Each structure stands twice: as structure tokens, then as C-alpha cells.
Symmetry: C3
Subunit: 149 residues, 3 copies
């Protein structure tokens, strides 16, 4: 069920929630897509040190389901996006939440928007890859979000 989104020097892998009892299969896939680091945006359900073990870096920035990400998180997220793909050309950043339909897709959307896409373009571009990518509240949030390249 791995969802991949590209544009333009950016590449994202939106993924589901793993467990200690399924982390093996989950890492194998990450390694396959050239994932250098993964940003967990939801609640912890497995031990991240196991991932860090295999050479994949981890950043744990969880925020409430449905609710909008803090200013700090959006901030860090964008800093990470801006530098990683430049420092490491062709790499891939995996972001994952529980369902993979709200929180992760939103950070991916804010990245596309900062990259020059209109919000309605960023929403379709993503749903192109993940059927039910956003709920009403989240859509409204993306609609009122103001970028600064």
C-alpha cells in the first residue's frame, strides 16, 4: 500500500502505521524506495530505534488527529524538505501517520504548495495517488494556508 508523490526535486513516500510485529516488512519496503529518513507525525506504536538501527533516520513530530500541525512543526518540516533534497539529490522522505489519509498527506501538501503549486492543485495531485486523502476540516486548513516560498 505504498503511496509515492514526486515534484520536482522532491519525492515523498506516504505510508501506513507499522508495529513491532510488522516493522520488518515495513523497513524492507522503505529501503527499497531509497528512504533515508522517515518523519512519524502520529502517536508511537513501535520502537523507532529499530529503524535508526538500519541506517534510516527518524524524526518524531506527532500532532493530534484532525487538528492542524503547530507552527513549529510546519516550520521544521519545511526546513527539512528544503535542505534534504538539495544536500541529498534523488533521496526520498517517508512521512507516515496511522491511516495515511490526513496528517501525513497534509505535510506533503504544504510541501507541494511551497514548491509553487496552488492548494487545489496539491490536493488533486495527492488524491491522484491516495483515493480519500483529506477530510473537510483539513481541506479548509489547506485552503486558508498562506505560503512564503
Amino acid at each position: 500500500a505504498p503511496v509515492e508523490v514526486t515534484y520536482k526535486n522532491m519525492r515523498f513516500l506516504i505510508t501506513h502505521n507499522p508495529t513491532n510485529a510488522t516493522l520488518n516488512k515495513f523497513i524492507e519496503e522503505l529501503k527499497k524506495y531509497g528512504v533515508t529518513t522517515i518523519v512519524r507525525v502520529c502517536e508511537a506504536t513501535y520502537d523507532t530505534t529499530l529503524v535508526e538501527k538500519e541506517g534510516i533516520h527518524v524524526l518524531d513530530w506527532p500532532f493530534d488527529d484532525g487538528a492542524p500541525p503547530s507552527n513549529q512543526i510546519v516550520d521544521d518540516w519545511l526546513s527539512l524538505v528544503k535542505i534534504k533534497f538539495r544536500e541529498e539529490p534523488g533521496c526520498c522522505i517517508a512521512v507516515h501517520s496511522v491511516a495515511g489519509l490526513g496528517r501525513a498527506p497534509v505535510l506533503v501538501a504544504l510541501a507541494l504548495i511551497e514548491g509553487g503549486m496552488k492548494y487545489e492543485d496539491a490536493v488533486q495531485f495527492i488524491r491522484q495517488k491516495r483515493r480519500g486523502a483529506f477530510n473537510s476540516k483539513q481541506l479548509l486548513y489547506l485552503e486558508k494556508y498562506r505560503p512564503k516560498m
Copy 2:
């Protein structure tokens, strides 16, 4: 097996011609892709009343196999496209013919062109999603087509 095409605020779903026996599953799939309105461009082989009842709206704009759509159809189709994606950002409009290689992709192409894409680009864009998407007559039609809006 449904083909999906998107750019930029637009997002289309080209489906096969369902049947009364598979309609229930056909409707669940549409709902999941976020389709609010479907456009049947071919000869009727199933009853749409059940689709209308499940909340999805049907537009019967059939036109001759191989022959180009009339000005009326082209006009209504482009009108629906411009409006629907405006009214419900992030939604999807389903289009379907019989084989899904001619009439259906032709309307999709026209939308993309008025969307700012050159015909050659639109032809390739759709073929990456639907292998043998056009015949010689349909290609010549799209080449001589003059973008209105």
C-alpha cells in the same frame, strides 16, 4: 481497472461500461474515488436510476462511435468541467464509453487542452494511462481542435 488522469485542479476517472449485475460494486468504487457526477458518452446498456439514487449524478451525452462530439456536447462538457472543480475542489468527474479508448479519452483530452496543454502533450499524457487511447481519426480531430476558453 480504472484509469485516472489529473492536471491541474482537474481530476478525471475513465471507467468501463458497467452492467446491472455489477452496478452495486461499480457505485462503491466511484464513491471511493470521490466522483459526484458521471458522464455516459455511449449507447445505454445499464440503468442509471440506481446510480442517481446513491447520490451520484448522471449526464447522458452519447455521440457516434468514432465520429467527433458535436459543438453542443463539447460545450456542455467544458462547462461542467470548469464549474464542478470550482464548486467542489478535490472532486473527480467520471467519464465512460464502451471500450474507453475513444470517445471518453477524447473529452478528457479536450479538457486538458483548454487547461493549457498542447494536443501532443494531452495525447501522451493520456496514453501513459490508457495504452491505445486514440485512433487516426480521433488524433486528427484533436490536432485541428482550436482551444476556446
Copy 3:
């Protein structure tokens, strides 16, 4: 499964080595993908004549596995590309290598770069369709490439 890449009026099909001696099905799919020409970049069993007999033009431009293609090859490649897609809009150029992870995607990459994409862009675009499409050498080669302008 077949690795296909589109942009904008260009469309490339990266192929492996025609399985189980039955190049019959290999040719059937090429024709379905609207392939008119095939660029063989490796050197192996492949009844080149059987293919051309079926209607598909074959060009033999083999080069060192891992090493950068010569300037003549890039030259011919680039003209082949510009020519063919203008000549027959909507067609497809197949690129044939051994593993379809190096030599082939590099050429495809050079075409996208010529199309206006920056190398990071072209590297992400292709890996979107083919997981491990480039090795270190190849990535560094594309970083130093400079399109003839």
C-alpha cells in the same frame, strides 16, 4: 509492471530482456504501447531482424555498463528523440538495457533534461516509476551534464 515515462510530448518505455525466448509477446506489447523505434543499449540475444520484420525500427547503440555513453551516442540519441516525436505525435520510443536500472534510464534522463528539467527533477521523475534507477557514478554523471544550448 512495464516502466513507462511521459513528459511532455515525449514518451519512453524502458524494457528488460525479452523473457522465455518468446519475443512474440515482447513485440505484441511494444505495438500496443505504440512503439515505432527501439534503442538497444546493451548487447544480447534478441532477434533484431524478427523485430524489424514486425514493423519496429531498431537502433544498436551499445555502451559500457556503468560508464557514461559517448558523445556520439548522446548526440544521436538527442536528435532521434527530437525527430521521432515531432514526426509521429503520440508515438513511443523503447529503450532496452539488461537490468533497466542504469544505461536505459540515463538516456531517458538526458531527454527530460533537454526537455527543460533540471537533473534532480529528472532523477526523481524516473525513480517514481523505477525504484533503484541510478547508481553513484550515473548520478554524478547527470549532475555534471550540461545540455547543449
